[PDB]
Amino acid sequence: HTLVWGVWVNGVDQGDGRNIYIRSPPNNNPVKNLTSPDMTCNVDNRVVPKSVPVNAGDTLTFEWYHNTRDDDIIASSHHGPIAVYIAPAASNGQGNVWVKLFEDAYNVTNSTWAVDRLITAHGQHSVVVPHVAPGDYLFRAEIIALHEADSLYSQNPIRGAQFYISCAQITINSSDDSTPLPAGVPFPGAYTDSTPGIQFNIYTTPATSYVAPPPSVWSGALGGSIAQVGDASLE
Ligand SMILES: [Cu+2]
Incomplete structure (x- = not known):
């Protein structure tokens, strides 16, 4: 159980985004x-009043929390991957529009899931803003908790993979459009x-055998990190 509090741009906190620039679920x-339909942008997908201004190449940091800002972030049971997708805002997330900018699942070097490192990072994971056409975008941050994913939800609705999905409204102002955004996958539909x-059974299947859900990271994506960019405690 986790939510996005807000974003940082180049290590500058944009402030509480909840129901402001994040399409926050209740x-x-x-x-x-x-x-x-809740797979698109979670259960309350609607235009919220603010879109965060960024330029291509900015570091955009999502900040997650559990109950209060900079708390336990997400229950340590919730092992799994993190992905970030982008869609033009006019799509409202509908149709074949979602392009993957980031994937981190199980790190064999570190022996840790993305979610384990997200907790260590005080809820912070980042992407480099891609060189797409200037305009309004949705950035769909998706944590999959796999602790009950041995079952399909469709066979047992008390279990199944758990999607924590947050759509941030981001406006890309300065961009040379060196990597125009292609068509992407639909949510719902891609999974x-x-x-x-x-x-996936984390109890019986080694995390070293885990393959995150396609699609692959787009060739236009410039990378990211799971790492604390900003210290909320100093505010
Ligand atoms: Cu939970």
Whole structure:
């Protein structure tokens, strides 16, 4: 159970984004129904009043929390991957529009899941703003908790992979458009009962064998990190 509090741009906190520039759902419960319209941007997808200004190449940092800012972030049970997708804002997230900018699943070097490192990073993970056409975008940050993913939700609705999905409104101002955004995947649609990485038993299957759900990271993506960029405690 986790939510986005806000974003940082180049290590500068943009402030509380909840229901302001984040299309915040009413609570931190996961989406689990892979065919749900809730897979797009969680249960309360609507235009919120503010879009955060960035330029291509900026570091954009998502900041997650559990109950209060800079707390335990997410229950340590919730091992799994983190991804970030981008879609033009006019799509409202509908259709074949979601392009993956970031994937981090299980790090063999470190022996840790992305979520383990997200807790260490005080809820912070970052992407480099890609060189797409200037305009309004949705940045869909997605944590999959796999602690109950041995079952399909479709076979047992009390279990299944848990999607923590947050859509941030980001306006890209300065961009040379060196990597124009292609068509992407639909949410719901991209993940099905047969997709690799949706059904996974962390109790019996080694994390070293985990394959995160496609699609692959787009060739236009410039990278990211799971690391604390800003100290909320200094504010
Ligand atoms: Cu939870």
